Structure formats: C-alpha cells, structure tokens
Amino acid sequence: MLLKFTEDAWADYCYWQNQDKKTLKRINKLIKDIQRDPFTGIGKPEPLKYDYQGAWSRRIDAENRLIYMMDGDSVAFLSFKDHY
Amino acid sequence: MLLKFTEDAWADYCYWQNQDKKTLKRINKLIKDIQRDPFTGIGKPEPLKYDYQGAWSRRIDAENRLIYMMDGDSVAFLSFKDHY
Amino acid sequence: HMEAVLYSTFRNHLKDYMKKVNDEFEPLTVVNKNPDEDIVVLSKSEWDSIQETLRIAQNKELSDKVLRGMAQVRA
Amino acid sequence: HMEAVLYSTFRNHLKDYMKKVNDEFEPLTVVNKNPDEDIVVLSKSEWDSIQETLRIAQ
Amino acid sequence: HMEAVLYSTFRNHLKDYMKKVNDEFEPLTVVNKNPDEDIVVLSKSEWDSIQETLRIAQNKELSDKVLRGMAQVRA
Amino acid sequence: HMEAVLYSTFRNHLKDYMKKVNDEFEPLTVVNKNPDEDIVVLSKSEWDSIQETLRIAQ
C-alpha cells in the first residue's frame, strides 16, 4: 500500500507539521486507519460524487477534511486543509 | 399590528414581486401569519442570538429567510432574500 | 428523471420503500396533488455523499485543489 | 439545518411530518435500528437547489 | 465559561440534566478522563436558534443588511 | 446532518457516544418522552469551532 502525495497535499501535511501537533496526530491516526482499510473506519469515510468521483473524504476536525483516492495498490492524498 | 419595512427589506420584497409569483405568495402568507402571532406559526419561527439578539427568522424556502423584529406594537422586516 | 410514487403507495409500503432507496442508491420523489407538496426521499448514505461533495463544491479554492490534484494522480 | 427522528415516531406521525417537510424546509433523517433503512426526507424545493449548486460547480 | 459536569454524574442523572439544559437555556460540557472525548450538551431549542444565528453570521452580506436594519428600527 | 438516539441507549453507551461525536464530528439528538426535554450533544471541537465563527462575525 504505497502512499502518494500531490504537491498541494504535501504542502498541507507540512503546514500541520509546523502548526498544531494535535491535528498532526489526528491526521496520522487517519492515515494509519486508511492503511488498514481505505473504505471503512474512523473519521466517517464518504465517497464524493459527480466531478469528484473517485475521491474520498474523512473528517480531521469540524472544519478540515482529508481528501484521498485509491488507484490500485496505493493511496493518494489530495488535501489536508480546507482553507488557508 | 403596524408594519415597518427597512429600505433594504423593501428592495428584497420588491425583488420577489417581479421575479417569482410563487415566492411572493409564500412571503405574503408568512406576513399574514406574523400578524396573528410573530413568535409562533408556520415557517419555523426562530429567534436569533448574540449580535442579532432581538431579530427573528422564518423560512421562505431552502435558500431565503424572512428576518423580522418587534418594535412594541409593530413588526419591522429586515430581509426577504438571503444573498444576491 | 426521478422515480415518482404516490403518497398512498408510499405509506402502504413504507418500510419497504426505505429499503429500496438504500439498495437502489437512487433518489425517489413521492408526488401529491399539490406540485409543491411533493417531497424527495433519499438514503442517508447518498445524502452524506451529496453533502460532503457539496461542501467541497461550495469552496472553489479547495475544489480547484482537489480537481487539480485528481488530474495529477491520474496523469 | 437538519432535524432527526426515529422511525417509530416518524411512522405514527407520517402525514404530519410530510406536511412540515415543505413548510419548515428542514430535511429529516429517519433513524432506524438497521442503519441500512435510514432515509433522509426533504422538500423537492431544497433538492432542486442542491442540484443547482452542484450544477454551478460543473 | 461553561458548567462542567463529571462523566459519571452526567450519566447517572442524565434525565435531570436533560431538564436543566431546557430550563436554564444554557450549554453544559461533560468531561471524562480523556479530554479528547469532551462533549457539549445543549438544549434542542437553543441548537436550532444557534444554527439560525450561525447561518446569518456566515453570510457577510446578509449579516450587514440585518445588523444595519436593527439599528434603524431601534431609533 | 443529525442522528437520533434513545436516551436509555445514550445513557448505557455514553462513553462510546462521546467517542463517536468527537470522531465523526456530527451532532446527535437524545430523545426522551417529553419533547421539551430533548437535547443536542456535540463535540467540544465542533462547539469551539462555531463560537469562533460567531465572534469572528463581530
């Protein structure tokens, strides 16, 4: 199970690395749970529809979501922060 | 039951008068129901809080709210259209 | 395009129609005499999917971020 | 703006909830013991707006 | 601030605290040992009013129109 | 969205529900018999997030 990051996702991941260790731990717990099973588990996974079909969403907190997608033997993160 | 409109609320009401006949009829039914009792009735009357304490809300449709307030023996309308 | 049914047939096979919108994963309007009185019944699963998609769609910055990223993952 | 009701309460007051769905413009989740019977009930007015927004995202 | 209720006190007297939130119109927070599990307990009436207020505060344009209007009516 | 929970089920599985609202970040309504005693339970995270928005308005 490879872990892909787009540039924008890695930028989001490193923002939470510098700010808020608690949110970083939450994101990490979600990544572990995704690695166990990308379709079920904590953070209420929800598939997205229409022009975002193929992408999935879990809840980091009330304001932020972890957008990811599965292409074969890998998980690809699209976002870790909702607004800057 | 005296009826007050602000300049902006009147523009909202004049918008629905030329746009949708059906919205105009719903607004008119709410105004009729505010007159019998401003705090209960159809449209789910809801009081606003914090900086809007005093104002009240009713549902015109899913997107637009009827926002009013009391002034003794009068109802002062604040809005008939949420966003333009 | 949505499957329309009568309120009578709806109240009759109530619990069965609830199992239909979840299995079929399809929305369903129950129609009445008043063209406004009609309502849409949907599965909570699809609803959560629509709402989460909507929250991304309402935010252009994040929609742009997601759609761009999705293009790079497929390309 | 979401309200939730259990199935038993929703079935006993079915007609009263159907009317209120289109007057208060507040969707209703019908919570069951089997979550695969859970449904959301909303006015068609609200559905067309949701689909209008998704159309604007295009 | 907010009234803080211990987890076991809240659990034992849940029916009583369901009455207190609806008569005092005030939010309570319930706390256990793990502060990541802290919850806020609200009156369902207050919650609908808070949602309505929150819907206005998210519309900067509607927020101004309402707020400017209350001033004209107060005069 | 909104879920509804029987108050006896809420009481018996309290710690599990305080874990659920803080993991899924959704509100739930706890129903009793008197509907004027109905309560909404939400996470401390989502609460602080709303109060933050309401004071940002000022």
From TrEMBL, chains A, B:
InterPro entries: RelE/ParE_toxin_dom_sf, YoeB_toxin. NCBIfam families: toxin_Txe_YoeB. Signal peptide: none annotated. Coiled coil: none annotated. This is Endoribonuclease YoeB. Belongs to the YoeB family. One of its GO terms (biological process) is RNA catabolic process. GO terms for molecular function: endonuclease activity; hydrolase activity. Pfam families: YoeB_toxin. Gene3D superfamilies: RelE-like. Keywords: Endonuclease, Hydrolase, Nuclease, Toxin-antitoxin system. It comes from Streptococcus pneumoniae serotype 4 (strain ATCC BAA-334 / TIGR4).
TrEMBL record, chains C, E:
Antitoxin component of a type II toxin-antitoxin (TA) system. Belongs to the phD/YefM antitoxin family. This is Antitoxin.
TrEMBL record, chains D, F:
Transmembrane segments: none annotated. It comes from the Bacteria. Antitoxin component of a type II toxin-antitoxin (TA) system. Belongs to the phD/YefM antitoxin family. This is Antitoxin. The chain holds residues 1 to 57 of 84 of the full protein.
